[PDB]
Amino acid sequence: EVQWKVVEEINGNNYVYIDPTQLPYDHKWEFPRNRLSFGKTLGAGAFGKVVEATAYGLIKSDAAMTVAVKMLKPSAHLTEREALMSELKVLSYLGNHMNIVNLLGACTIGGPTLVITEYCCYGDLLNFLRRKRDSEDDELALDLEDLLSFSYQVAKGMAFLASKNCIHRDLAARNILLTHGRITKICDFGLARDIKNDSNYVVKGNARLPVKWMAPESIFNCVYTFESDVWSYGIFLWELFSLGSSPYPGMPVDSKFYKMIKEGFRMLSPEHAPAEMYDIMKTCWDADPLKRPTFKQIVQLIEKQISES
Amino acid sequence: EVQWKVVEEINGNNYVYIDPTQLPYDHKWEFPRNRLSFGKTLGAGAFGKVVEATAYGLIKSDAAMTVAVKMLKPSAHLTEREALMSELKVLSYLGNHMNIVNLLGACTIGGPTLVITEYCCYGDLLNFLRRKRDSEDDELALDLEDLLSFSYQVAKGMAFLASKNCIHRDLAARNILLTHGRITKICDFGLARDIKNDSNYVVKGNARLPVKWMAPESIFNCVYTFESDVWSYGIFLWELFSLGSSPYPGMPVDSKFYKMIKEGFRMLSPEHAPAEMYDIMKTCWDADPLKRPTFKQIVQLIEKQISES
Ligand SMILES: CCN1CCN(c2cc(Nc3ncc(-c4ccncc4)s3)nc(C)n2)CC1
Ligand SMILES: CCN1CCN(c2cc(Nc3ncc(-c4ccncc4)s3)nc(C)n2)CC1
Numbered sequence: 001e002v003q004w005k006v007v008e009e010i011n012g013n014n015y016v017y018i019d020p021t022q023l024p025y026d027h028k029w030e031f032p033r034n035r036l037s038f039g040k041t042l043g044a045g046a047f048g049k050v051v052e053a054t055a056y057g058l059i060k061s062d063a064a065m066t067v068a069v070k071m072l073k074p075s076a077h078l079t080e081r082e083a084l085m086s087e088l089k090v091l092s093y094l095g096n097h098m099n100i101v102n103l104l105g106a107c108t109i110g111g112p113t114l115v116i117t118e119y120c121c122y123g124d125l126l127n128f129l130r131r132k133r134d135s136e137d138d139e140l141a142l143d144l145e146d147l148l149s150f151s152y153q154v155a156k157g158m159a160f161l162a163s164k165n166c167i168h169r170d171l172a173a174r175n176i177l178l179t180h181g182r183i184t185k186i187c188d189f190g191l192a193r194d195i196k197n198d199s200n201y202v203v204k205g206n207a208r209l210p211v212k213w214m215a216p217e218s219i220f221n222c223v224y225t226f227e228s229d230v231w232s233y234g235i236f237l238w239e240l241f242s243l244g245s246s247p248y249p250g251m252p253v254d255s256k257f258y259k260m261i262k263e264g265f266r267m268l269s270p271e272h273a274p275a276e277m278y279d280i281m282k283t284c285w286d287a288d289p290l291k292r293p294t295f296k297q298i299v300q301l302i303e304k305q306i307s308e309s
Numbered sequence: 310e311v312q313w314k315v316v317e318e319i320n321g322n323n324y325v326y327i328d329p330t331q332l333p334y335d336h337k338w339e340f341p342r343n344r345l346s347f348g349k350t351l352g353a354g355a356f357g358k359v360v361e362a363t364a365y366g367l368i369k370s371d372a373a374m375t376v377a378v379k380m381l382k383p384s385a386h387l388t389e390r391e392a393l394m395s396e397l398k399v400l401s402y403l404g405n406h407m408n409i410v411n412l413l414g415a416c417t418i419g420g421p422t423l424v425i426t427e428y429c430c431y432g433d434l435l436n437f438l439r440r441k442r443d444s445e446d447d448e449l450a451l452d453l454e455d456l457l458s459f460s461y462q463v464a465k466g467m468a469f470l471a472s473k474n475c476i477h478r479d480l481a482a483r484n485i486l487l488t489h490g491r492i493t494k495i496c497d498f499g500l501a502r503d504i505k506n507d508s509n510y511v512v513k514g515n516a517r518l519p520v521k522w523m524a525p526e527s528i529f530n531c532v533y534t535f536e537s538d539v540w541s542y543g544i545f546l547w548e549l550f551s552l553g554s555s556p557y558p559g560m561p562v563d564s565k566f567y568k569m570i571k572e573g574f575r576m577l578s579p580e581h582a583p584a585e586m587y588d589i590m591k592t593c594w595d596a597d598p599l600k601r602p603t604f605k606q607i608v609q610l611i612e613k614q615i616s617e618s
Contacts (some may be wrong), residue, residue, distance in 0.1 A: 111434055122447050122450070122451060122616075123447055127447075128447070131447075131448060137443070138431050138436075138437070138440075139440060141430070141431070142431060142491075145489065145490075179618050180454065181454075182451075257323070309430075309491050
């Protein structure tokens with residue numbers, strides 16, 4: 001199951017997705033696998049893993065560079081092998097942006113498929129926030145500046161994705177990475193996350209889904225849109241200003257939970273969210289998708305708050 | 310006593326200082342004092358203080374901006390009034406640099422002299438470090454990235470000063486400010502610090518001097534050079550990687566202290582200084598001033614460590 005989808009047409013409220021198996025792979029990305037030295041495993045699911053590695057001569061012929069390599073475990077079946085190749089083709093289709101985990105190369109010959117991406121040295125944003133949660137005015141002001149910056153950067157990364165007609169479908173702090181300079185990068189662990197052991201992914205129908213992050217139109221109609229990604233961004237803002245607390249606290253995903261969300265029930269503001277960031281969340285959680293803001297508009301709104309400093 | 314001196318000639322190991330009272334003041338800096346609204350006091354000495362204020366229409370005609378205003382207290386005498394004006398003239402002589410507290414304007418008519426500079430919103434680096442001292446691998450790595458950045462930025466600020474033939478004479482973490490984006494800015498509180506109540510300033514001769522930060526040639530010959538500023542930067546590095554501990558721990562400034570420093574005694578490395586930053590400190594503490602590195606060279610050395618990431 002390819003996670004990032006790419007739309008080609010909107011034929012009056014119905015998306016025409018592009019078959020990722022029909023996207024090109026440009027051999028400019030090809031890199032010899034014997035110039036990768038594999039290190040620790042950074043994440044692993046049932047069928048896939050991401051491993052830290054050193055790449056010799058990937059960018060400059062005389063330099064080594066730390067990278068992340070996505071690969072399948074031997075237990076993987078054909079559909080997982082296709083998905084890895086489709087993720088490779090989507091990533092090269094997207095192109096490069098500062099706030100996404102970028103493609104650096106690939107090994108598609110001489111062994112199983114390897115996908116080489118940037119390595120983010122501080123790990124996932126969710127764990128970063130929860131450490132600061134477990135852990136005076138100047139210190140709090142500086143933390144608020146970081147959180148404003150993270151929301152700005154994720155919003156730019158998502159605006160870049162939407163500009164390439166790409167829908168993320170699993171936006172959440174656990175899928176955002178932090179790296180040098182406090183730069184945040186959107187990624188998808190996809191096959192490299194063990195979702196069977198993550199309570200945030202819930203059984204609904206024939207899938208395990210991050211329901212507390214999903215828009216209502218996605219839960220009752222299984223549709224994923226640019227507007228539903230905006231909804232997820234709103235949920236992301238709530239965990240961001242709550243220091244990584246899980247959304248809808250003390251409320252498990254029952255059938256009771258599903259009722260409330262169609263009743264227009266929303267979360268209240270996190271205690272220390274700035275009013276104008278709370279205002280952005282609420283508009284992301286509009287029951288009407290076409291009343292939610294676009295990521296381009298969210299970028300402008302957050303730019304204005306940061307400039308007021 | 311003007312703190313920042315400006316040299317004009319080096320006539321074989323003897324400096325010709327420029328009389329700051331002979332530097333021009335350009336009226337382009339003139340700003341009406343009735344467009345300042347004064348707030349809290351940020352620091353105060355015997356004769357002077359620095360106050361936070363809002364300046365209406367200072368940069369853009371339609372915008373307010375937070376600034377810092379240096380001014381004298383009524384107890385000030387003629388020599389302090391001249392010094393404030395000389396500091397104004399040095400600051401406009403220096404020009405603008407990202408890593409110094411820059412001049413934004415001045416009120417030299419219609420009341421006592423006011424000097425308007427950038428406001429740094431996180432205060433002094435020394436208190437910032439001591440809070441982190443009172444206060445796992447990802448968190449420590451990120452702290453080390455900040456400390457590397459602070460040493461790089463202070464070194465660029467000092468290289469800019471040396472390039473303008475300016476000697477600071479009181480470089481220390483207490484004279485470095487932190488502001489938005491974790492930018493550090495060199496300043497001098499000068500008349501706005503109460504040095505009578507600061508143990509770091511010690512009675513030597515007819516002055517109160519920061520002896521633990523001074524080069525030996527400055528202690529026994531009362532000479533201040535570009536090379537003695539480099540010495541102070543080395544001491545600054547030691548407090549930086551020690552999280553604001555006072556230099557030469559458990560050793561008061563006796564006559565015994567003076568003996569040891571001419572004996573070539575130096576501090577050992579802070580426990581978590583990177584080897585290459587320790588190497589920079591040691592070279593800053595060379596008994597021969599002409600064997601110390603220049604700030605231009607320190608900038609290059611630290612740039613290389615940061616690039617290795
Ligand atoms: C020693 C302390 N730590 C702990 C944790 N720590 C990290 C780093 C990290 N870096 C990644 N870079 C790219 C990734 C990726 C690429 C493509 N698709 C999906 C994911 S994951 N990821 C994790 C989960 N933990 C690093 C150091
Ligand atoms: C509410 C919590 N705090 C605590 C402390 N805090 C600050 C800010 C600050 N900002 C400065 N900007 C320029 C300065 C200057 C200009 C010219 N010459 C010398 C100095 S001092 N300075 C201090 C000492 N504390 C700010 C907020």
